[PDB]
Design a binder for these strands. Structure first.
Length: 170
DNA sequence: GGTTAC
């Protein structure tokens, strides 16, 4: 039951809790850190690339998303995150930009002086509908393996995020 | 862990 002012309070602190998980704001994440730390993220899908199997390396499936949250400029593209899956395609099925996404277990690291996010093997996630859409089926059924059960605490934070995102781009 | 992605 938090409003638009509490959201800014939390985020502007770097680390913040929601439910039983501590989250890193998009901003503080990009604080280019050499040491690879694992974090949880919560934000709006600013842009994404559909699931495609890699053509090299261990050839794992990979979907890419760019995350956005208030601590960013409505202009910036967000934090880049590559989500990999060695166990088949049980990755987030994203329909459109604007959808709130919670990610659990993301390695933060550097690529060409910038910060980048790489998914841990056992990463889990939760995806919400794009509330600010004339469509009500913006969220399609998700694969179960990595799907987190969420409560009203994160549901509220997801509404807030999508609301604040909608305003800054209407 | 950070090759695949880029």
């Amino acid at each position: 039951v938090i409003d638009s002012l509490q959201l800014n309070e939390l985020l502007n602190a770097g680390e913040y809790k929601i439910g039983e998980l501590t989250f890193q704001s998009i901003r503080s994440s990009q604080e280019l850190q050499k040491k690879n730390t694992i974090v949880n993220l919560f934000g709006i899908v600013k842009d994404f690339t559909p699931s495609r199997q890699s053509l090299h390396g261990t050839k794992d499936w990979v979907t890419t998303v760019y995350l956005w949250d208030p601590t960013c400029d409505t202009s910036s593209i967000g934090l880049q995150i590559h989500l990999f899956s060695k166990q088949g395609n049980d990755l987030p099925v994203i329909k459109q930009v604007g959808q709130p996404l919670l990610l659990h277990q993301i390695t933060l690291r550097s690529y060409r002086d910038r910060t980048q996010g790489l998914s841990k093997d056992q990463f889990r996630y939760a995806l919400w509908p794009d509330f600010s859409s004339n469509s009500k089926d913006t969220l399609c059924p998700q694969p179960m393996p990595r799907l987190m059960k969420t409560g009203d605490k994160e549901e509220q934070f997801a509404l807030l995020l999508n609301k604040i995102w909608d305003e800054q781009t209407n």
